[PDB]
Symmetry: C4
Subunit: 206 residues, 4 copies
Amino acid sequence: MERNKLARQIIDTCLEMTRLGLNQGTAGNVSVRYQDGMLITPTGIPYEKLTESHIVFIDGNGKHEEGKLPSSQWRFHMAAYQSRPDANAVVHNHAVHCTAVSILNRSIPAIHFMIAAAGGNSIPCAPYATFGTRELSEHVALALKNRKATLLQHHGLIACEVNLEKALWLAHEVEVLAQLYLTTLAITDPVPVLSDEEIAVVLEKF
Amino acid sequence: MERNKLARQIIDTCLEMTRLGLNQGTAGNVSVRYQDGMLITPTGIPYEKLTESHIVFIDGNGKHEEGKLPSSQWRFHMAAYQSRPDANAVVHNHAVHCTAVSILNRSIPAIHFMIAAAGGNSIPCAPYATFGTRELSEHVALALKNRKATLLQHHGLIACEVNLEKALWLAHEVEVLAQLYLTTLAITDPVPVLSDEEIAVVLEKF
Amino acid sequence: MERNKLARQIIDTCLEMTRLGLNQGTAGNVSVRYQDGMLITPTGIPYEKLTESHIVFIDGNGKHEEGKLPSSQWRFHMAAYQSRPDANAVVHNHAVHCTAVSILNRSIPAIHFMIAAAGGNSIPCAPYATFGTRELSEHVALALKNRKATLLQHHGLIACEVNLEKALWLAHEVEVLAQLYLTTLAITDPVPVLSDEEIAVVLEKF
Amino acid sequence: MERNKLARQIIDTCLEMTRLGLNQGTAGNVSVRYQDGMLITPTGIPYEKLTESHIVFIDGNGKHEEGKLPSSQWRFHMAAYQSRPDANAVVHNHAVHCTAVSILNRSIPAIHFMIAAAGGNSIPCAPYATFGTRELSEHVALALKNRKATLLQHHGLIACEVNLEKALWLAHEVEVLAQLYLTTLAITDPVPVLSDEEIAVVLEKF
């Protein structure tokens, strides 16, 4: 849990995300909670040229390391950390099914019992705001109060978890749910869902 | 046909399943019939770290090996073995097309002559019950009486066969049928099917 | 152009077909024109264990090599060779988009100018008949009179060409056209097409 | 920035394009601005056999290197260079989602803020004309006046940029937008879009 172990795992999560087909068009950014702020991927540099030394440190005040350029979306990574004290890693991407559900400005309802991995009976969609603004950070903060992952209207997905392995796994699970949702919505609307009682049982079991 | 040969093939089926894109979100579990019970994949451990020694033995009484954690779904693997004496291997996954047909709570009708590989003119959908309960096991048992594969409502797929190679192949064939079904259902409902007479001919030929 | 050079290229076309995602559920069979009959893939043996010595020779009379089992579909490979004297290689598969168009029992109309690679302004769909029968061979023979590739109702695809490289390329092009067709048909029916005049120009240019 | 460095990068862009699944059916062609004309991929030769020496030089007058066959589409590569003086690389492909939107003869509207990477609030669709004609070149020229990428009706996609890395990235981004567009259009028409004001903000930010 030295800085370079964490910088390598960020990089492995970036490569893994591309492997899973969740980072189409190289839009992802990943961070982890570190000291008083976070370590995050940089802007510019393509994932495959990334080395430990490229990872940027952003302190609690939003001051980034000199000579480096943090991802343009660092502020909503910071907003997730302040909003969910249990989160230690955040994954952002523009996975196609999640992003298509974000364009329709729909929440994903309980069409599958794995919806409970994100903490309740849905995956919310936070309203649009221009990237990099305080207003976007505020919508992200509010959507993650009771959920570990949220869609971002006309944009993509944010998933947070206790470590990078689980944040990536969650992100992948939400992308499967989004695809399941869109494939069934084309056939029938509304899509059959599990009731609130059944999701209460599944949450108690998890 | 020693325990470790069977433990390695379980592991190869897990890797192969991921290769085929049937184990999206690492939800699969695989077992084989062994002695008086079965060998099954464990809970926890990600497929790529799996070694022969991780495979769990569950006897006929549901007593698992000490110091190991069997998959959370072991009971419906046991229910398949007791219900289909000819089955020697069971594959479970949450393949996206199968799972989307399971959400619509539809059986897959005879839209292609390969439907007969599962033993009749359809692929049933067993009703939902919370994972890991006796009630789920009962629905699985009844659906596999005359079929070798069944959808699981709001959940995924179970396929059984005489060995792991054929169980995996069947699972893959059902996922192609599910995708064929959903792609055509978007265009036209109902989807044209082969008659019962034609499926009788194909079954006699197989 | 010795038998083993041709047996290796059959095997390479099988591997390549799987690479392209056209041989989902390992249903393909490939042949080439040889001497008075053809060399074809066998039944049984999974593509990855295939060796030169597994390829079967079937003469002009339908007598296959002793000790080998030719693909169960050899007769419509023979029907293609007798029907199209210019064909020297035949590829059959159950590619998902082609097979979904075959289930709807539609021809693919001229939605893209590459439709002309198969010889006219469409890709026909031959009517269903049980696999391996003379009746299926007759429908294949008639559909390939003026086309180099045909859909097979409730079944899959047959593509023929002057060599294996081009037969595989054609098969792939028809699978792209099928997907283009189905993706657009979901939105609007009918799908806009190029006129017969325009396809005449493109054919003269090819 | 010697000829062979540029010939290798063309070849790497061809391989990369296939890796991304944008060159389905090996229809792509790539060029870069060189001296008074351009270096372009040849016709014939499959991408995997391509070597530096296969890349063709076409001067400003349309005279190609002796003993070589330039891509059949060289003229609309030349039309892009003359129409967009800032372009130094052009990518053409028949990516399936782009091509399906080109068949519907639709522009892609501002369903995602990344639409602004191509220079405005849409991705146009240039009208059909037979491949290789002056008339096609004219439609391409006019569509790229204020956009860096355009769909080509019943055909595919053209993307241009300051270097090959960015031209490929743009091409990929347009293919994600096309898929997002088609996946949402199946559910609801019209698809919700970002307003002209919001795209003005995003353009100023880029």
